[PDB]
Amino acid sequence: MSKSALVILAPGAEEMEFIIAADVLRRAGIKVTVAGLNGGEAVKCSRDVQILPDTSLAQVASDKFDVVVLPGGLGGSNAMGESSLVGDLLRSQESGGGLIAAICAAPTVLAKHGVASGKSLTSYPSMKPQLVNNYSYVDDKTVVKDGNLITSRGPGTAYEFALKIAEELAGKEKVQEVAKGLLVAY
Amino acid sequence: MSKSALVILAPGAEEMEFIIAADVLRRAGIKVTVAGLNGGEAVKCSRDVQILPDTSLAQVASDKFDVVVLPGGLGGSNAMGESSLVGDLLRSQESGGGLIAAICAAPTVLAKHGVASGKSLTSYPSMKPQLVNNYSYVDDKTVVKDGNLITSRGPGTAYEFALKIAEELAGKEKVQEVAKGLLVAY
């Protein structure tokens, strides 16, 4: 009847990347929960934009989501990488064959929590040396999908990233109409 | 020696275009003030994302900004169009020789306030009929500049819109570095 997405909002997140994934997913008819990393309070992002989450990560820790989305930004990614809760939830998503999606610096969260080893991914270019030892790093793609893992490079790739997630959950036709309304070629 | 931008955040604002404007301008070293239309409280956006403004529009009313930026979204544009304070600041900005930038449905804000009549502009494609009478509408163009007016079309043109404003205020070398960091060709 419906597909869900958990979007984790962490202090120091790249707000553009975050907002694009939340907003595009909602456009495509997906039920998006924005879960604040440390609570239900406003999250101060990387360029000082403050965003109210829908709820806390902790409050949706017993729920299943068709996709777990990790926005990038160095500080948001560092916070998610240190969070034992993010680790538990990511291992859970991997073992239920659910989608994991990470953009920009956020794929280092996968490395930090031992998730999705041996898969192909990309990231923001400056994070590559953290991601070559246990993953096949892709240098030449804006978005990479390998089994249940979708990763992407940064702000210039965030619309394509969100649309690719949307396409897996909501289908081709829906995403075509969504992309048309965005004025995004896809 | 810095430059300044007022970004007006209004209820029903298209959050992506809003966040992209605030973030990209901040990356370019421009002092950004995010000012809530109706006060300093959180603003609910078109897709239910809630954003805390830096301050209220009312509180920056005697301030001079090098640019006044209007994000789009239909609810947001309609609210701005009804606001006498928006009108007053657009007119003052216009008399003052300062920059005005409006994306998506936001150009209709200038129509509602009788601002920049006869100027060349674009908008979200379906909003064209609202604009053809009193403006010189340009169909096939992502970002349109006429003197101190900059307009653009939608989410898919938001980066270029923001980078175009950034370039006017911060210069070519700065915006090239910012575009490089964003992974946006510009």
UniProtKB/Swiss-Prot annotation, chains A, B:
Query: What phenotype has been reported when the gene encoding this protein is knocked out?
Result: Viable and fertile. Larvae develop normally but show increased oxidative stress-induced cell death. Larvae show structurally normal neuromuscular junctions, however they fail to show structural synaptic plasticity in response to oxygen species (ROS) levels. Adult flies show severe defects in locomotor ability without loss of dopaminergic neurons and increased sensitivity to oxidative stress. Results in altered subcellular localization of Daxx. Does not show more elevated levels of methylglyoxal adducts than controls.
Compartments, record wording? Mitochondrion; Cytoplasm; Nucleus
Q: Where are the transmembrane segments?
A: none
Q: What does this protein do?
A: Plays an important role in cell protection against oxidative stress and cell death by acting as a oxidative stress sensor. Does not play a role in methylglyoxal detoxification. Plays a role in mitochondrial function together with Pink1. In motor neurons regulates structural synaptic plasticity of locomotor behavior as part of the PTEN-phosphatidylinositol 3-kinase pathway in response to oxygen species (ROS) levels.
Q: Which organism is it from?
A: Drosophila melanogaster
* Chief location: mitochondrion
Q: Which UniProt keywords apply?
A: Cytoplasm, Mitochondrion, Nucleus, Oxidation
Q: Describe the processing and modification events after translation.
A: Oxidation of Cys-45 and Cys-104 in response to oxidative stress. Levels of oxidation increase with age.
Task: Show the active-site residues.
Answer: C104
Could you tell me the gene encoding this protein? dj-1beta
Question: Record's Gene Ontology CC terms?
Answer: cytoplasm; mitochondrion; nucleus
Protein name per Swiss-Prot or TrEMBL: Protein dj-1beta
| UniProt cross-references to InterPro entries, sorted A to Z | Class_I_gatase-like, DJ-1, DJ-1/PfpI, Prot/Nucl_acid_deglycase
Q: Which PANTHER family match?
A: PARKINSON DISEASE PROTEIN 7 HOMOLOG (PTHR48094:SF12), PROTEIN/NUCLEIC ACID DEGLYCASE DJ-1-RELATED (PTHR48094)
In terms of SUPFAM superfamilies, this protein maps to: Class I glutamine amidotransferase-like
